[PDB]
Amino acid sequence: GSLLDGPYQPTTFNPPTSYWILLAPTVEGVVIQGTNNIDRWLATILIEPNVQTTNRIYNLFGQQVTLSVENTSQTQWKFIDVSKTTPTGNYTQHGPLFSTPKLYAVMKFSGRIYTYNGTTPNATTGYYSTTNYDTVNMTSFCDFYIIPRNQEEKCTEYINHGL
Numbered sequence: 064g065s066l067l068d069g070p071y072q073p074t075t076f077n078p079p080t081s082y083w084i085l086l087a088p089t090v091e092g093v094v095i096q097g098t099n100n101i102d103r104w105l106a107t108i109l110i111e112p113n114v115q116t117t118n119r120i121y122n123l124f125g126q127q128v129t130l131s132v133e134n135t136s137q138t139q140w141k142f143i144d145v146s147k148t149t150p151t152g153n154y155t156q157h158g159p160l161f162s163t164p165k166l167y168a169v170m171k172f173s174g175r176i177y178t179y180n181g182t183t184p185n186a187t188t189g190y191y192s193t194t195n196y197d198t199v200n201m202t203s204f205c206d207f208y209i210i211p212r213n214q215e216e217k218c219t220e221y222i223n224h225g226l
């Protein structure tokens with residue numbers, strides 16, 4: 064794919080703005096985490112199908128965090144954005160994406176971190192307003208690709224329909 068740079072291996076990096084980071088995880092757990100080290104700690108976790116409400120432990124920024132999660136779906140995996148605004152506070156859950164292809168994407172743009180949400184094949188975007196957004200450093204725990212924003216409809220197509 065001429066619009067799909069990669070695959071790249073799990074790494075810690077400061078993504079450039081206006082680029083979608085297309086994530087291709089395999090198992091349940093932490094997909095990606097990122098922070099500005101001031102007032103936003105954001106991660107995305109992945110939940111396999113058929114998970115009744117339960118406490119699960121996730122390794123987030125080097126510590127054990129217990130979260131109450133669920134995936135009702137039988138056919139779709141669930142991405143959940145988790146976010147805290149202070150180093151010592153609680154994570155809250157936002158912008159879930161129920162996904163058949165098992166693909167996710169994040170982007171730093173216009174004061175925000177954008178992710179996908181909703182239900183494939185009709186997924187939309189949401190965002191998290193982030194102080195000094197372009198400073199956000201990210202660790203991907205899975206293989207990933209890069210797509211420019213000017214080709215967002217293509218990133219959206221990948222999110223909805225897979226590679």
Ligand SMILES: CO[C@]1(C(=O)O)C[C@H](O)[C@@H](NC(=O)CO)[C@H]([C@H](O)[C@H](O)CO)O1
Nearest residue numbers: 146147157158180188189190191192193
């Ligand atoms: C308070 O405003 C916002 C934000 O502009 O950040 C609005 C945004 O739509 C929302 N996104 C979503 O819920 C999902 O995409 C986001 C979020 O709830 C918080 O940032 C989490 O701390 O809050």
Ligand code: NA
Nearest residue numbers: 158178179180
């Ligand atoms: Na999301």
